Amino acid sequence: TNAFCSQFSRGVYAIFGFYDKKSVNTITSFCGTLHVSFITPSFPTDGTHPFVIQMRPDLKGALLSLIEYYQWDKFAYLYDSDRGLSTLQAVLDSAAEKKWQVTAINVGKKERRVILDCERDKVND
Amino acid sequence: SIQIGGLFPRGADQEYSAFRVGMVQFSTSEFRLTPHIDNLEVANSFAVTNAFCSQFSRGVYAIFGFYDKKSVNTITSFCGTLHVSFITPSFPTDGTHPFVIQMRPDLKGALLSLIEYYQWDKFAYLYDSDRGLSTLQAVLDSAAEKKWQVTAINVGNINNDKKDETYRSLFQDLELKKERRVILDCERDKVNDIVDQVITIGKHVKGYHYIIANLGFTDGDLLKIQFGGAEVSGFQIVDYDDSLVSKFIERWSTLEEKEYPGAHTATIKYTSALTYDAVQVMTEAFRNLRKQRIEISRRGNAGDCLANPAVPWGQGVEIERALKQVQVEGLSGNIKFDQNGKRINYTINIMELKTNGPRKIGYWSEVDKMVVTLLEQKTV
Amino acid sequence: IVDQVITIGKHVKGYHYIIANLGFTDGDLLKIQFGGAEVSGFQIVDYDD
Ligand SMILES: *[C@@H]1O[C@H](CO)[C@@H](O)[C@H](O)[C@H]1NC(C)=O
């Protein structure tokens, strides 16, 4: 908030930057309010929020199509709560239609198929 | 005079009414609580920030209010930074964040204990993302650990204008998987919608079991699904059998509707009761501060909330602890807080819906888990 | 009666109800519309005229 207000007070025409799941609402709200465009490599906003340019493309469709490609029915989905649950909720909503059995584990049954969904460092760990 | 800021969402009439009633009941000659009320859209981070900065610039000693999942991070961050204690009836924060006093007890443990009580290994979890996903993570971890079959579906994203079509569709999905057991962890209106659709399609008959996961079970409308034959279980944090709650209701049911909106009824939503209890907690907190001869009085103006660098006032911590050491008896039963602002040593009544109306079959203690409370045809 | 039928769940497929009154569309038909039961009635007011 302080950084945004500082950059705004300076009179910038645009703001490039990053946000977390705890700071995303501040960015989207303030940028939607002051008509100041925000550019970000971070995760796409969940919604239609304006004045936010997300460089990162959506991963939901490719992931679901990949799961359907390998013909997976039962698998385990590891997820980081520090990063977010959006894709998890997506595959959970898609689980009924595609007949999936998902075992969700938060990393923040003879299971041989695992989805990681984490930071590159956490993935490396 | 002790200046405090109130933050109320647009449309919470009964909560603000219970706030005023709580102000009248707990008023004293020792000191006088002076609320500054801000009615706003609680889901708006900008409005919440502006209101917070306003109350802070005014120099309030404490802030009571509500928050959504979109504005909660702002509250926790600003309160943790500027050391301004926040009091709330809303959902418990996911974490240990400081300067946040949550009146709402944790519902996850009671929910899990209820799931284990009916011995469910396979069910459906319908949930709203507006409060938090922590409970979802809980039932998922318990689904994995206890080897269950849970179908979690998010109904939060669906638009209300075209909603009945997707409802019919989702129920077609639930009739596909032969799902007869459903848990609603949703907003009361969302719960009403889902219930209405269940009734419409006829899944409210015998063989179906619904668990309404909210603090109040009797706060919503139970009459329409009462004679259906389906088992309906829920939770109740406000026990109307207590003499305190009995008297409070005796006065609450007679209150003027013109002056106090939604305050003429025999029942009260748990949020409003938690508001009342919150007023009580604040009163006791400042009373204890005055009893300990600890001076919290502001020397000068609090200044701008965005002042760089941000230096927190010193007595804020004193106020925070003063709020967290309070142990009293309210509408929500025993009110006692741990150091993180969470409710401890509370009791959540487990309710079942019968033909003669809702009935308590037991209760869930904070440490004791779930404990139960202890026309036939002829045989030839 | 409709509310009670819906409540107990007799508004599903296999049931047929005949409303004997001049207006069929005068009341709320939405609640028994998605039940699956066949519902027949009478209409003296033709809105197509
Ligand atoms: C809860 O607090 C009450 C007093 O308010 C006390 O008598 C009781 O022993 C406590 N129980 C537990 C389980 O902590």
Side-chain angles (χ1 to χ4, degrees), chain A, chain B residues 1-35 37-167 169-176 178-246 248-257 259-298 300-374 376-380, chain C:
Chain A
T1 303
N2 279 264
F4 180 87
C5 293
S6 180
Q7 299 287 355
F8 180 80
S9 298
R10 288 185 176 273
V12 297
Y13 297 91
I15 302 182
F16 171 78
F18 298 79
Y19 52 71
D20 194 86
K21 72 172 192 301
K22 304 176 181 179
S23 61
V24 53
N25 296 320
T26 300
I27 292 296
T28 55
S29 182
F30 273 80
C31 291
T33 301
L34 302 182
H35 288 196
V36 179
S37 302
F38 192 87
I39 299 92
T40 170
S42 300
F43 66 95
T45 63
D46 305 330
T48 57
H49 310 80
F51 299 97
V52 175
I53 314 300
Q54 299 126 98
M55 293 293 160
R56 177 179 303 184
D58 189 31
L59 188 63
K60 307 182 195 304
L63 180 60
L64 293 177
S65 299
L66 186 61
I67 299 176
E68 188 175 356
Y69 172 74
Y70 287 144
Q71 295 175 327
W72 289 12
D73 53 25
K74 175 182 178 182
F75 57 90
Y77 189 98
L78 307 185
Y79 66 97
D80 185 25
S81 57
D82 298 5
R83 194 168 98 142
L85 295 78
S86 183
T87 61
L88 169 63
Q89 297 175 260
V91 306
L92 283 179
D93 293 335
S94 299
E97 180 182 352
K98 308 293 181 177
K99 277 294 180 60
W100 290 340
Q101 287 184 330
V102 185
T103 300
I105 300 297
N106 189 341
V107 76
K109 297 185 182 181
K110 310 190 169 181
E111 217 75 39
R112 298 295 174 264
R113 296 172 175 178
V114 182
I115 304 182
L116 291 196
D117 191 9
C118 297
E119 193 192 11
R120 60 161 300 268
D121 298 334
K122 210 170 192 60
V123 166
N124 278 278
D125 295 330
Chain B
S1 179
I2 304 181
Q3 297 79 14
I4 64 180
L7 268 62
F8 288 85
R10 292 290 186 176
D13 298 4
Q14 188 183 79
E15 290 77 5
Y16 185 65
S17 300
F19 182 83
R20 298 170 60 203
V21 170
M23 282 300 306
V24 176
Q25 178 74 359
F26 300 106
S27 60
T28 178
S29 301
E30 309 178 30
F31 55 93
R32 187 213 322 271
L33 284 180
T34 308
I37 306 302
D38 287 327
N39 303 122
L40 59 84
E41 181 179 356
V42 79
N44 198 327
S45 301
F46 180 81
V48 167
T49 302
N50 280 264
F52 180 87
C53 293
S54 180
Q55 299 287 355
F56 181 81
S57 298
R58 289 185 177 273
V60 297
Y61 296 90
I63 301 182
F64 170 78
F66 297 79
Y67 52 71
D68 194 271
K69 69 111 163 56
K70 304 176 181 179
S71 61
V72 54
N73 298 275
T74 300
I75 290 296
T76 55
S77 182
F78 271 80
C79 291
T81 301
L82 302 182
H83 289 196
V84 179
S85 302
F86 194 88
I87 301 92
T88 171
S90 300
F91 68 95
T93 62
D94 306 330
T96 56
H97 310 81
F99 300 95
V100 175
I101 315 300
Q102 300 126 97
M103 294 293 159
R104 177 179 303 183
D106 188 31
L107 188 64
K108 304 184 253 62
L111 180 60
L112 294 177
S113 299
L114 188 61
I115 299 176
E116 283 191 344
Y117 175 75
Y118 289 110
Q119 296 174 328
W120 289 9
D121 57 324
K122 176 181 179 297
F123 56 88
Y125 182 66
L126 307 185
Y127 67 98
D128 281 343
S129 58
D130 298 38
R131 315 171 321 283
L133 296 181
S134 183
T135 306
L136 170 63
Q137 299 174 58
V139 305
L140 283 178
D141 293 334
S142 299
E145 182 179 352
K146 306 293 180 51
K147 288 172 184 178
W148 290 342
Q149 290 183 330
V150 185
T151 300
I153 304 176
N154 188 36
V155 305
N157 196 169
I158 302 180
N159 301 329
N160 297 357
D161 49 324
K162 25 121 295 182
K163 73 195 311 180
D164 311 330
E165 192 201 311
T166 1
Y167 285 160
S169 183
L170 71 85
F171 282 115
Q172 199 182 67
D173 298 305
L174 291 191
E175 188 59 32
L176 169 274
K178 316 280 187 183
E179 216 72 40
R180 299 295 174 265
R181 297 171 175 177
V182 184
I183 306 182
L184 287 10
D185 191 8
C186 297
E187 199 81 58
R188 61 152 300 165
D189 296 334
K190 208 71 177 187
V191 167
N192 278 346
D193 295 330
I194 299 179
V195 163
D196 289 334
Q197 204 82 345
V198 164
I199 299 177
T200 301
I201 63 175
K203 284 190 179 300
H204 61 301
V205 299
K206 186 184 182 182
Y208 292 85
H209 197 346
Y210 300 97
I211 298 184
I212 320 297
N214 49 21
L215 284 192
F217 178 61
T218 60
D219 294 10
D221 182 32
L222 307 170
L223 287 174
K224 48 185 176 180
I225 20 92
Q226 179 171 327
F227 310 98
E231 249 74 30
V232 183
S233 298
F235 309 94
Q236 187 67 21
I237 192 62
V238 182
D239 203 330
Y240 296 91
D241 289 329
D242 294 332
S243 59
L244 197 155
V245 183
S246 181
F248 174 81
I249 267 59
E250 281 180 4
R251 178 54 184 168
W252 180 270
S253 58
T254 58
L255 293 175
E256 195 175 24
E257 185 102 35
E259 236 302 287
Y260 308 143
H264 203 69
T265 64
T267 61
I268 176 180
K269 297 178 300 179
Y270 65 94
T271 57
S272 305
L274 289 179
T275 292
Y276 180 89
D277 294 335
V279 177
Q280 180 179 6
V281 165
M282 298 179 63
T283 303
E284 271 291 298
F286 287 103
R287 176 179 291 100
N288 293 355
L289 271 180
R290 290 186 61 259
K291 182 178 295 296
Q292 299 164 2
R293 299 139 54 258
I294 303 177
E295 188 76 21
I296 55 176
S297 179
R298 265 189 167 94
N301 298 329
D304 190 346
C305 58
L306 295 184
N308 193 316
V311 43
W313 65 335
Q315 58 276 62
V317 175
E318 205 72 273
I319 298 181
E320 182 194 15
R321 185 195 320 273
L323 278 160
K324 296 178 172 180
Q325 290 177 344
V326 170
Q327 182 177 180
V328 291
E329 196 73 19
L331 301 172
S332 59
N334 186 266
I335 309 173
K336 189 200 183 181
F337 305 94
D338 51 23
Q339 61 182 355
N340 297 331
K342 318 297 179 179
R343 284 286 298 271
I344 60 178
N345 196 342
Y346 56 92
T347 298
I348 304 180
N349 300 332
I350 283 80
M351 313 278 294
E352 282 189 356
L353 182 60
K354 297 300 180 180
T355 309
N356 54 333
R359 196 155 194 83
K360 175 186 67 177
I361 69 169
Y363 75 96
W364 187 91
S365 182
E366 195 258 338
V367 299
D368 297 333
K369 304 301 161 197
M370 175 154 312
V371 180
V372 291
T373 310
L374 62 156
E376 36 225 296
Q377 77 289 354
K378 262 171 158 291
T379 303
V380 176
Chain C
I1 298 179
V2 164
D3 290 334
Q4 300 290 345
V5 163
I6 298 178
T7 302
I8 62 176
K10 285 189 179 300
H11 64 301
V12 299
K13 186 184 182 182
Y15 290 85
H16 198 346
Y17 300 88
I18 300 184
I19 318 296
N21 50 23
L22 286 191
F24 180 61
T25 62
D26 294 7
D28 181 32
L29 305 170
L30 288 174
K31 48 185 176 180
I32 19 93
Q33 180 171 327
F34 308 97
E38 292 178 349
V39 182
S40 298
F42 307 93
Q43 191 69 21
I44 191 62
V45 182
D46 202 330
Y47 295 91
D48 290 330
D49 294 332

